[PDB]
Amino acid sequence: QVQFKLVLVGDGGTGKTTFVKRHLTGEFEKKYVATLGVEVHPLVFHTNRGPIKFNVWDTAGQEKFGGLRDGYYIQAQCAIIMFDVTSRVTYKNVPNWHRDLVRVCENIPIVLCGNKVDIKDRKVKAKSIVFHRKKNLQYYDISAKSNYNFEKPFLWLARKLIGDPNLEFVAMPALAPPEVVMDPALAAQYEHDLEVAQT
Numbered sequence: 001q002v003q004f005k006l007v008l009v010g011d012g013g014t015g016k017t018t019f020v021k022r023h024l025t026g027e028f029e030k031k032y033v034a035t036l037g038v039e040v041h042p043l044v045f046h047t048n049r050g051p052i053k054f055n056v057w058d059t060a061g062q063e064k065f066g067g068l069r070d071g072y073y074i075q076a077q078c079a080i081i082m083f084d085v086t087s088r089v090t091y092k093n094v095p096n097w098h099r100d101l102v103r104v105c106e107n108i109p110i111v112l113c114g115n116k117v118d119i120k121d122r123k124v125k126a127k128s129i130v131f132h133r134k135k136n137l138q139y140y141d142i143s144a145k146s147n148y149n150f151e152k153p154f155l156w157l158a159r160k161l162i163g164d165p166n167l168e169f170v171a172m173p174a175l176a177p178p179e180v181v182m183d184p185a186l187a188a189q190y191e192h193d194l195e196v197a198q199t
């Protein structure tokens, strides 16, 4: 089976667990790891070159005691660093999560995700999101609760992991029905703000 360990890191409360739980089978088939304080979610996606499985390591909350232990990271093949777009301090900590990540795994492909963009009073805007630009990463706005851009980080990762740019997902995974509707107005504005920042 084509399988990658994906570690999901970032400040406590950014919505890392809410995000991974959108993938319904991934939540139903998760495996708790005694030693490590971790739940590992098998997120399978179906691409035009066959199935791929992201084994997502979600923390049990230990990041809310200080940077989790070293074994959580080892043998990761890819990563998502999350922050919260309504809390600047979580954005300020990205370089730290990245430092730890690169300290234990080297140059694994890494997607940066700004979460909770369904929330109207957004604090960390496209213009201020520059970290991915310097450290060679991919950035996406997401809203875990509305499934907004859910597939994007995993499509970009699959593209990088497999070595292929035209790779598509042939079918969407079954996702938790949205708990908020992502405001189409807000989506358009954000997409416009990103395109502008990027030029």
Ligand SMILES: Nc1nc2c(ncn2[C@@H]2O[C@H](COP(=O)(O)OP(=O)(O)O)[C@@H](O)[C@H]2O)c(=O)[nH]1
Pocket (backbone or CB within 6 Å): 010, 011, 012, 013, 014, 015, 016, 017, 018, 019, 115, 116, 117, 118, 119, 142, 143, 144, 145, 146
């Ligand atoms: N509005 C909004 N709230 C969210 C989103 N994702 C998570 N949350 C809320 O943020 C809080 C922290 O979520 P959690 O998944 O436990 O974060 P973690 O500590 O990084 O695992 C919870 O109250 C979630 O309901 C989102 O996309 N939008």
Ligand SMILES: [Mg+2]
Pocket (backbone or CB within 6 Å): 016, 017, 018, 058, 059, 060, 061
């Ligand atoms: Mg969590």
